Amino acid sequence: PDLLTNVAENYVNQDLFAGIEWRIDQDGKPIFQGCAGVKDIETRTFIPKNAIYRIYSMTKPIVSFLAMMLIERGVFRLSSPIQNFDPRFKSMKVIDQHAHIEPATALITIEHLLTHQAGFSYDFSLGCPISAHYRDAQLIEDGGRDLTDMMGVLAELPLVFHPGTQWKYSISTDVLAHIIECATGERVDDLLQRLIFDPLDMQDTGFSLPLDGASRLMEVYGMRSLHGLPALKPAPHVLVPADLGSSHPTDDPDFRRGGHGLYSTLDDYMAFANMLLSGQTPEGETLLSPAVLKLALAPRVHFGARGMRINDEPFAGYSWNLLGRVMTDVGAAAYATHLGEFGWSGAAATYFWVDPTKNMTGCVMTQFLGSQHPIGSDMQAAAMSML
Amino acid sequence: SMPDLLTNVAENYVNQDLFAGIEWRIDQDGKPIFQGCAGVKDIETRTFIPKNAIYRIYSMTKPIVSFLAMMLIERGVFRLSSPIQNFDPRFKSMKVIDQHAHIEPATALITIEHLLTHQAGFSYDFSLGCPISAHYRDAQLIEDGGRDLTDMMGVLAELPLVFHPGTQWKYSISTDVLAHIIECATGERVDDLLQRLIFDPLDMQDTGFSLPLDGASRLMEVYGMRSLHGLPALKPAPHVLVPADLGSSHPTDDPDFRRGGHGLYSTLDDYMAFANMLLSGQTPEGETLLSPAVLKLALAPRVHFGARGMRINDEPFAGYSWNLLGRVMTDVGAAAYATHLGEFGWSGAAATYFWVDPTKNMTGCVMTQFLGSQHPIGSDMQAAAMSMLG
Amino acid sequence: MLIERGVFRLSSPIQNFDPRFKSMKVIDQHAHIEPATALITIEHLLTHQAGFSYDFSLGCPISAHYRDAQLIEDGGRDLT
Amino acid sequence: SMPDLLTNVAENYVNQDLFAGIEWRIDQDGKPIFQGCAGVKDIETRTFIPKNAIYRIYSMTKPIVSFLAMMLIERGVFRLSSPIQNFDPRFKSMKVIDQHAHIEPATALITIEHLLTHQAGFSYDFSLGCPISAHYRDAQLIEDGGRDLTDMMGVLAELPLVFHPGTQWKYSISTDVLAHIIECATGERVDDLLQRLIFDPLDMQDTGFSLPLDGASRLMEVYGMRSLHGLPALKPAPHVLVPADLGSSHPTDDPDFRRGGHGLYSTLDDYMAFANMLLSGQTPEGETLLSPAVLKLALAPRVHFGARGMRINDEPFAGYSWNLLGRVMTDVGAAAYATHLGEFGWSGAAATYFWVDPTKNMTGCVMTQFLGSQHPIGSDMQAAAMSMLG
Ligand SMILES: O=[N+]([O-])c1ccc(OP(=O)(O)O)cc1
Ligand SMILES: O=[N+]([O-])c1ccc(OP(=O)(O)O)cc1
Ligand SMILES: O=[N+]([O-])c1ccc(OP(=O)(O)O)cc1
């Protein structure tokens, strides 16, 4: 049966998500797709054609792919120290949970940024020795602050471990976007447009809305604590519109970030996902060589007993490569997958995957912050089970 | 023939514009042997240090409330092993948070002993890098001095600890929890218990959580830029003699203000009475406040530290272990300033400091008011006194 | 099959379906008892990593209490 | 000037309906310095505590049988290193079981020293979570008091140990094994040996495994809900003053009942005679029961514990190590109630407790009958006496 529809319709019928779209492609063509629910529960408008989503950290694989392109082109390399491009990142310090501060004993590199092993953290990180100082500095909160200036403020704060030595999901993709700007003399949104979006015909993807985008923007729900005091337990899963403050503007021509901030559509994100199966456009234009794509996808960070975790939530059987998660042990996985399946997700519950063993890609688009229901993994499992 | 190094230290500090006013006294065999004063009550006015000047002693409150706990143990109200949840069920089912966002139930009950040793897993609002201090600040545990002790404890009780009770050491709000548990166990207020069991018998008439009737004109001005409850600083505040803003954390005339870990006003003379008593457990007249057996139980080294040593916000207390009342010198060859084996006492945020040295039958106290001092005046005065007493 | 059908998932805490399994404790061979520090999941049950034992388990810190409770012995008792 | 905290403790316990009747005595320099009684013989009848009241002292039997072992060592019957299998071949070829169902041969012989230190690997029927206690209960080792010591030991000998002899510590039935090995080595009965070598010389006329002829009317009633040999409890039995059913585990008039780890009846006065003797190894008249060298051998700390400390059924004995006769205080800074370095003694299941404190030439004993007390009356009485003796 159509497990994907059953999952999505159950979520809508239980008042857990307002609206959901999905598509799964094989060999670059749709084999499953659908939608459930509405754009917004307040007026129950149907999900529009080419509906627009805040994809949050699904921005990261895109910005990471751009960095790989610049590496291939010789702009910098995995081992390049970031201080070479912005000296504000010379002389970093490292703080610990016992209030001890000392100089970093290793320089932060491009590779560290792409692997979240640089020692940065995130404003919303619970129990973190530095997240209070991120919150005070409004790093995530102040969406109106130019990328360049936000980085100056971040650069003055201590890391939470010595670069290279541990893993922690972090604001490092934003650092990467900034370093890209320093290295190229170009803005990251312009680079993304020219090198990735245009070639893949992703006309609806950017850090601001298309001129006709307002009526297509999905409403966002949920109570997650994104820049306030980190919650000691998850907020109740209730469909109430989320307040994004000034963290995520719709029409700021200078808003650009590395770790979040893109608006996209299901169709646009599917084009990016399909490309990751080969490094080419559908017409056959190369965006990244097979060699460098293999370098980007190979498992690079391996995890101990407790596995990969973010705010203590597990990613069972996953390792980290230069673009996001990668399945390295089906016997440890918590939901259907195959060896080498890779991808990432976003705070508003958007999720995608690429499964090279099946030449398969999939994406679930929805808008819920702080979900207590792992819709992304439920939809991947459903799709896997339908092959 | 040794010169007066005590006066020299105090004088230099005042002449260097580092502290406004400083008073000190060192007693031996219960009688003053060195004493002095330097500077003024306040720098704005240069009013002279009044007779019986009054100081906010902050954590020098801790040895007093700890001593009261020991008296109650001696009297059978509770024991070191008593789980605090027996007296306040709000402390049943504690959780423990870590630096990786992981929360789990505590695997051990918090006891009276844990509170007196700072091994309960509590923290403090100003603790830099702490997995929970952000939640303390949001709750305004320290900032909101007007909140009753009992109500503040209800808010604290809902927060997780930062390690499992008994398994580590971290200087903390646990003495406030102890003051509260004392009230739960006895059905009395901690300020009344302190008044009747300690202050009255020792004639400490100027000591309490609010100013005496004639106290306002005797209150020393407090200086410095330490932030007691704001975002913890990444480096020490500059040492500048500017008056400190205490907000509403340390009221002068709130008849219900009472705490375990700070909040007392006292005077040099009153505190010396307490310190001298600690040499024997008796009042000068010979009333026993605490038997020699239980005083020995309280002073014996109880928490021992591992290479890193005892630290608070990463500042070292070199060669010190912890007993039920505060610090205790356990290795002179690791000490960072003059002392003798067994020397004990504590200090307060505004740079007040005292010690008791049983090998010399000596006590010492320096009183001053500076929050966030970059100069360890307490240890400098102790070292000076040690150097002067053979 | 029920996982494939979406009834629950490997990571589902069992207490979500029967709250009698909230607040489990853990015993050891030295008589020490403490609260469990992790919730039991469907995956734990399928892998025998939940911490349960068996009435007939020799040397087990809890099998005596299973035997006293007749868990295996009392076949007539309803599963629930 | 210190008030009578001993009477206060006892009184409160009786007035709170927590214990039926309590007697205590503290001696210094071999003469009574504090003493008293509180409550009644039995709550049903409220009969007053009789003269020379008799108590089941349970594991306060252990220091007595241990002391007899030391006398026999001094006399050359055996040595600390003697393998017990030399005296009873039933203890040849022991096995060791673990919590994972694995059984293997013991890699070391059990010695006299192992039995006196509870390091032989034996356990006890009531031990919660134990790899072997289920088999002890099936065998009715404790329950069947009517079974001769010699026969019970044959049944025990067939069971595996829970660790290899010498490698760990667990409070156990090993003192019963010792009593038995004493009988094997000497060809005499342990009760006769105790009578001749210890009770007679110390004039302990009311002490033995059966009641004196006029004993029944003097026997204190025993209360409480602890289950001595049933399925071990997952949490403490409620503390309720209801008479306890001892079944046939503790007969009053069985001329062959004798054990190493429990079973003696005694009186406060008789036990104080034993305790006082332990200060010197001599009778009041000056007969040597045990030379100073061997008494020192017996009292020196012999088993040292690792962070977790000494525990029995997970209850702590904080700051205590173990010597050949029972507990010994080795760190006052880890102690959970007042004491001095070197204080030693033991206690019994029905809440009887005694201590000897060589630094004060002091002994103390509290007698009461409550099985499974949730209130540590023994330690409370010790703390009270310590507080009263400077
Ligand atoms: O900017 N943000 O609010 C923000 C940025 C990144 C986040 O992380 P994610 O949940 O992995 O997308 C979550 C929130
Ligand atoms: O409440 N307070 O502001 C506060 C309490 C305790 C303190 O700790 P101290 O520096 O050891 O006195 C410091 C400040
Ligand atoms: O035989 N018994 O019933 C028995 C034997 C030993 C006991 O151990 P205790 O509590 O240390 O006296 C308790 C009970």
Side-chain angles (χ1 to χ4, degrees):
Chain A
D2 183 356
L3 298 175
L4 287 152
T5 301
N6 295 343
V7 172
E9 278 179 6
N10 180 63
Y11 273 133
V12 167
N13 291 352
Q14 295 204 286
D15 306 304
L16 296 175
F17 294 82
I20 303 159
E21 286 184 287
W22 67 95
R23 199 222 293 171
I24 287 76
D25 288 9
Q26 187 162 52
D27 300 314
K29 317 195 149 208
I31 51 167
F32 309 132
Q33 59 189 317
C35 70
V38 292
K39 191 182 76 175
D40 69 297
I41 65 167
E42 286 67 36
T43 74
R44 300 158 306 280
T45 315
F46 281 128
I47 295 172
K49 182 163 147 191
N50 306 134
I52 296 175
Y53 299 79
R54 307 161 187 84
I55 65 170
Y56 280 86
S57 298
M58 270 160 55
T59 299
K60 292 182 165 72
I62 294 170
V63 170
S64 301
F65 190 87
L66 171 66
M68 301 311 303
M69 293 174 75
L70 304 175
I71 283 167
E72 188 173 81
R73 283 154 204 239
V75 175
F76 49 44
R77 60 185 78 79
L78 284 175
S79 64
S80 296
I82 70 167
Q83 66 181 27
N84 290 5
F85 302 104
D86 182 358
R88 293 183 293 189
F89 289 90
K90 310 268 195 64
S91 314
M92 304 299 296
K93 295 175 153 164
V94 172
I95 189 169
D96 72 22
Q97 62 175 332
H98 303 297
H100 173 72
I101 299 173
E102 63 195 25
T105 52
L107 296 181
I108 303 173
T109 63
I110 296 301
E111 176 163 350
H112 291 151
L113 293 188
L114 288 161
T115 60
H116 296 269
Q117 295 178 299
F120 295 106
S121 190
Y122 249 135
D123 310 30
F124 47 80
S125 175
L126 169 67
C128 179
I130 206 47
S131 68
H133 293 256
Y134 281 37
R135 289 190 297 282
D136 167 85
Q138 307 181 300
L139 297 180
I140 292 311
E141 175 173 16
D142 191 354
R145 180 167 39 196
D146 198 83
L147 178 58
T148 311
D149 298 329
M150 189 264 274
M151 292 283 132
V153 174
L154 170 59
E156 284 312 295
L157 303 178
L159 308 164
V160 300
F161 54 81
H162 291 275
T165 68
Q166 298 183 23
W167 190 85
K168 181 172 192 174
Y169 192 67
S170 70
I171 197 161
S172 78
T173 327
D174 297 284
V175 183
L176 178 64
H178 170 243
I179 295 300
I180 287 168
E181 298 193 343
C182 299
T184 58
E186 299 191 72
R187 284 170 43 134
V188 66
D189 55 342
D190 293 333
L191 288 163
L192 285 178
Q193 199 64 56
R194 181 172 84 250
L195 288 186
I196 306 177
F197 301 158
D198 289 352
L200 290 173
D201 195 31
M202 295 160 65
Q203 308 175 39
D204 285 325
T205 299
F207 295 106
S208 69
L209 291 176
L211 289 171
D212 70 350
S215 71
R216 290 189 287 131
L217 178 61
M218 300 280 287
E219 175 68 278
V220 56
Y221 296 87
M223 244 99 59
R224 180 177 168 189
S225 60
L226 286 171
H227 67 68
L229 181 73
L232 296 173
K233 67 179 188 196
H237 195 293
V238 182
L239 282 175
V240 161
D243 188 348
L244 305 186
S246 58
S247 70
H248 204 299
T250 51
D251 298 290
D252 183 338
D254 298 316
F255 180 62
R256 62 208 193 281
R257 295 292 190 260
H260 70 285
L262 288 173
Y263 299 90
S264 199
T265 65
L266 179 55
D267 190 56
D268 277 15
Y269 213 95
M270 285 301 287
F272 177 70
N274 280 151
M275 175 279 295
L276 297 177
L277 280 168
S278 72
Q280 302 179 349
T281 66
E283 301 66 50
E285 172 177 332
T286 299
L287 297 186
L288 191 66
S289 65
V292 177
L293 183 66
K294 168 192 193 190
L295 184 74
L297 296 177
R300 183 162 301 268
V301 188
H302 307 268
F303 296 89
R306 283 188 59 68
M308 179 180 149
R309 296 197 174 247
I310 299 176
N311 219 69
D312 201 41
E313 291 307 305
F315 293 80
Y318 291 99
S319 296
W320 192 261
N321 64 28
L322 297 168
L323 311 183
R325 76 179 185 266
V326 62
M327 166 53 48
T328 49
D329 186 2
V330 176
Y335 57 88
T337 185
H338 308 281
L339 201 57
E341 167 262 295
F342 66 91
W344 201 224
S345 53
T350 59
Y351 182 97
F352 83 102
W353 75 91
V354 178
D355 184 354
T357 71
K358 290 300 170 171
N359 215 32
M360 177 204 327
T361 56
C363 175
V364 182
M365 291 299 198
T366 192
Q367 300 283 77
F368 196 104
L369 294 164
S371 168
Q372 296 191 17
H373 296 90
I375 177 168
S377 67
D378 285 347
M379 298 290 282
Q380 178 178 313
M384 295 282 170
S385 301
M386 290 170 69
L387 273 33
Chain B
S1 225
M2 281 286 332
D4 187 355
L5 298 168
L6 283 159
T7 299
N8 190 54
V9 168
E11 223 90 269
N12 284 349
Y13 269 133
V14 156
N15 296 343
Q16 278 254 285
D17 308 312
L18 288 176
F19 299 77
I22 307 168
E23 286 187 293
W24 69 93
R25 200 174 99 207
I26 287 76
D27 289 6
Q28 186 170 48
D29 298 319
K31 273 174 267 288
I33 188 160
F34 308 117
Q35 59 209 321
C37 61
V40 289
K41 178 179 85 173
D42 66 284
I43 226 81
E44 291 63 41
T45 243
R46 301 200 56 80
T47 298
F48 293 159
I49 296 166
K51 166 148 182 150
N52 320 107
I54 298 173
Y55 301 78
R56 303 157 192 89
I57 66 174
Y58 281 90
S59 301
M60 271 164 54
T61 302
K62 291 182 168 75
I64 295 173
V65 168
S66 305
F67 188 89
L68 170 64
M70 303 310 304
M71 303 178 67
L72 300 175
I73 285 167
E74 187 172 80
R75 288 141 197 254
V77 174
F78 47 44
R79 27 186 113 69
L80 286 169
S81 60
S82 297
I84 73 171
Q85 72 179 18
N86 288 2
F87 302 107
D88 186 353
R90 298 181 301 185
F91 292 89
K92 195 178 343 197
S93 312
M94 300 302 293
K95 298 166 188 181
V96 174
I97 188 175
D98 72 23
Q99 68 180 324
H100 304 293
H102 173 72
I103 300 183
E104 64 190 24
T107 56
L109 306 183
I110 295 161
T111 63
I112 295 298
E113 183 166 349
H114 295 151
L115 304 183
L116 287 159
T117 56
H118 298 273
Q119 297 181 294
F122 293 109
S123 190
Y124 250 138
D125 315 30
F126 46 79
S127 184
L128 170 67
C130 178
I132 202 60
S133 67
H135 292 255
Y136 281 36
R137 298 187 293 280
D138 168 82
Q140 300 189 251
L141 295 188
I142 286 186
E143 171 179 6
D144 192 355
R147 176 165 46 196
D148 199 82
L149 176 61
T150 309
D151 301 332
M152 185 262 283
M153 287 285 125
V155 180
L156 171 60
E158 284 288 280
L159 301 176
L161 307 161
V162 298
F163 50 80
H164 290 277
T167 66
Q168 310 192 2
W169 189 88
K170 182 174 196 173
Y171 188 65
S172 69
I173 196 154
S174 70
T175 322
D176 296 287
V177 178
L178 176 63
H180 169 243
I181 296 297
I182 283 168
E183 304 198 330
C184 293
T186 63
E188 306 171 58
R189 279 165 51 127
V190 68
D191 56 335
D192 297 334
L193 281 167
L194 284 171
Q195 196 65 57
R196 299 176 66 166
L197 293 189
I198 302 176
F199 303 154
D200 288 349
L202 291 173
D203 202 31
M204 304 164 57
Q205 301 183 46
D206 288 319
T207 302
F209 296 101
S210 69
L211 289 180
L213 288 167
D214 67 356
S217 69
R218 294 192 276 139
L219 183 59
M220 296 285 282
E221 178 61 284
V222 58
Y223 295 89
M225 287 186 303
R226 187 179 166 191
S227 167
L228 304 178
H229 59 73
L231 175 71
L234 297 170
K235 58 186 159 78
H239 194 283
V240 178
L241 262 193
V242 152
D245 183 352
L246 304 185
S248 64
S249 66
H250 205 301
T252 57
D253 296 280
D254 183 340
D256 300 314
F257 180 59
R258 64 208 191 280
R259 292 295 189 261
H262 69 286
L264 287 175
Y265 301 88
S266 194
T267 64
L268 172 66
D269 191 61
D270 279 9
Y271 213 90
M272 291 296 288
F274 181 68
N276 282 146
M277 175 278 295
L278 294 174
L279 282 168
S280 71
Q282 302 179 334
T283 69
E285 295 62 33
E287 162 173 342
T288 302
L289 300 191
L290 189 70
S291 67
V294 178
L295 183 58
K296 151 76 165 192
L297 186 68
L299 295 176
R302 181 163 300 264
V303 188
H304 309 266
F305 299 85
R308 195 72 192 142
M310 185 177 150
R311 302 201 165 246
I312 300 172
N313 217 247
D314 204 42
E315 305 297 320
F317 294 78
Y320 289 101
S321 300
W322 192 262
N323 61 30
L324 293 172
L325 304 188
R327 77 184 183 262
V328 61
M329 172 51 46
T330 50
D331 185 1
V332 172
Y337 58 91
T339 183
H340 304 289
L341 196 59
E343 167 261 299
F344 66 91
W346 199 227
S347 56
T352 61
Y353 182 100
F354 85 104
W355 71 94
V356 182
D357 181 2
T359 73
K360 287 296 186 202
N361 293 322
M362 190 209 313
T363 57
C365 181
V366 58
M367 293 296 198
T368 192
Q369 300 284 74
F370 197 106
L371 296 163
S373 173
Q374 287 185 19
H375 297 89
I377 181 174
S379 75
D380 288 338
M381 300 290 278
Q382 178 177 312
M386 293 288 164
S387 299
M388 287 164 68
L389 263 330
Chain C
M1 293 174 75
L2 304 175
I3 283 167
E4 188 173 81
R5 283 154 204 239
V7 175
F8 49 44
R9 60 185 78 79
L10 284 175
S11 64
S12 296
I14 70 167
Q15 66 181 27
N16 290 5
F17 302 104
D18 182 358
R20 293 183 293 189
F21 289 90
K22 310 268 195 64
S23 314
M24 304 299 296
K25 295 175 153 164
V26 172
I27 189 169
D28 72 22
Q29 62 175 332
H30 303 297
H32 173 72
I33 299 173
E34 63 195 25
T37 52
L39 296 181
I40 303 173
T41 63
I42 296 301
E43 176 163 350
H44 291 151
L45 293 188
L46 288 161
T47 60
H48 296 269
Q49 295 178 299
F52 295 106
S53 190
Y54 249 135
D55 310 30
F56 47 80
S57 175
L58 169 67
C60 179
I62 206 47
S63 68
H65 293 256
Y66 281 37
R67 289 190 297 282
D68 167 85
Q70 307 181 300
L71 297 180
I72 292 311
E73 175 173 16
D74 191 354
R77 180 167 39 196
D78 198 83
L79 178 58
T80 311
Chain D
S1 225
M2 281 286 332
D4 187 355
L5 298 168
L6 283 159
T7 299
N8 190 54
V9 168
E11 223 90 269
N12 284 349
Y13 269 133
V14 156
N15 296 343
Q16 278 254 285
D17 308 312
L18 288 176
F19 299 77
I22 307 168
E23 286 187 293
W24 69 93
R25 200 174 99 207
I26 287 76
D27 289 6
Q28 186 170 48
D29 298 319
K31 273 174 267 288
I33 188 160
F34 308 117
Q35 59 209 321
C37 61
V40 289
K41 178 179 85 173
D42 66 284
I43 226 81
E44 291 63 41
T45 243
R46 301 200 56 80
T47 298
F48 293 159
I49 296 166
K51 166 148 182 150
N52 320 107
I54 298 173
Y55 301 78
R56 303 157 192 89
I57 66 174
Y58 281 90
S59 301
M60 271 164 54
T61 302
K62 291 182 168 75
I64 295 173
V65 168
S66 305
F67 188 89
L68 170 64
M70 303 310 304
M71 303 178 67
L72 300 175
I73 285 167
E74 187 172 80
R75 288 141 197 254
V77 174
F78 47 44
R79 27 186 113 69
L80 286 169
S81 60
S82 297
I84 73 171
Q85 72 179 18
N86 288 2
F87 302 107
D88 186 353
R90 298 181 301 185
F91 292 89
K92 195 178 343 197
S93 312
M94 300 302 293
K95 298 166 188 181
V96 174
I97 188 175
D98 72 23
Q99 68 180 324
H100 304 293
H102 173 72
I103 300 183
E104 64 190 24
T107 56
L109 306 183
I110 295 161
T111 63
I112 295 298
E113 183 166 349
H114 295 151
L115 304 183
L116 287 159
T117 56
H118 298 273
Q119 297 181 294
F122 293 109
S123 190
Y124 250 138
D125 315 30
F126 46 79
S127 184
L128 170 67
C130 178
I132 202 60
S133 67
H135 292 255
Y136 281 36
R137 298 187 293 280
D138 168 82
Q140 300 189 251
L141 295 188
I142 286 186
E143 171 179 6
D144 192 355
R147 176 165 46 196
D148 199 82
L149 176 61
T150 309
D151 301 332
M152 185 262 283
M153 287 285 125
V155 180
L156 171 60
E158 284 288 280
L159 301 176
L161 307 161
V162 298
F163 50 80
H164 290 277
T167 66
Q168 310 192 2
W169 189 88
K170 182 174 196 173
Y171 188 65
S172 69
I173 196 154
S174 70
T175 322
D176 296 287
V177 178
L178 176 63
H180 169 243
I181 296 297
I182 283 168
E183 304 198 330
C184 293
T186 63
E188 306 171 58
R189 279 165 51 127
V190 68
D191 56 335
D192 297 334
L193 281 167
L194 284 171
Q195 196 65 57
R196 299 176 66 166
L197 293 189
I198 302 176
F199 303 154
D200 288 349
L202 291 173
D203 202 31
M204 304 164 57
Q205 301 183 46
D206 288 319
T207 302
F209 296 101
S210 69
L211 289 180
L213 288 167
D214 67 356
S217 69
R218 294 192 276 139
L219 183 59
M220 296 285 282
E221 178 61 284
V222 58
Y223 295 89
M225 287 186 303
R226 187 179 166 191
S227 167
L228 304 178
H229 59 73
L231 175 71
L234 297 170
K235 58 186 159 78
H239 194 283
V240 178
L241 262 193
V242 152
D245 183 352
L246 304 185
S248 64
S249 66
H250 205 301
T252 57
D253 296 280
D254 183 340
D256 300 314
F257 180 59
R258 64 208 191 280
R259 292 295 189 261
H262 69 286
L264 287 175
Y265 301 88
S266 194
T267 64
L268 172 66
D269 191 61
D270 279 9
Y271 213 90
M272 291 296 288
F274 181 68
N276 282 146
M277 175 278 295
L278 294 174
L279 282 168
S280 71
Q282 302 179 334
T283 69
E285 295 62 33
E287 162 173 342
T288 302
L289 300 191
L290 189 70
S291 67
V294 178
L295 183 58
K296 151 76 165 192
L297 186 68
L299 295 176
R302 181 163 300 264
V303 188
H304 309 266
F305 299 85
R308 195 72 192 142
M310 185 177 150
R311 302 201 165 246
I312 300 172
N313 217 247
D314 204 42
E315 305 297 320
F317 294 78
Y320 289 101
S321 300
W322 192 262
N323 61 30
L324 293 172
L325 304 188
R327 77 184 183 262
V328 61
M329 172 51 46
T330 50
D331 185 1
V332 172
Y337 58 91
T339 183
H340 304 289
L341 196 59
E343 167 261 299
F344 66 91
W346 199 227
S347 56
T352 61
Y353 182 100
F354 85 104
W355 71 94
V356 182
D357 181 2
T359 73
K360 287 296 186 202
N361 293 322
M362 190 209 313
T363 57
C365 181
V366 58
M367 293 296 198
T368 192
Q369 300 284 74
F370 197 106
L371 296 163
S373 173
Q374 287 185 19
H375 297 89
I377 181 174
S379 75
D380 288 338
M381 300 290 278
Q382 178 177 312
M386 293 288 164
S387 299
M388 287 164 68
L389 263 330

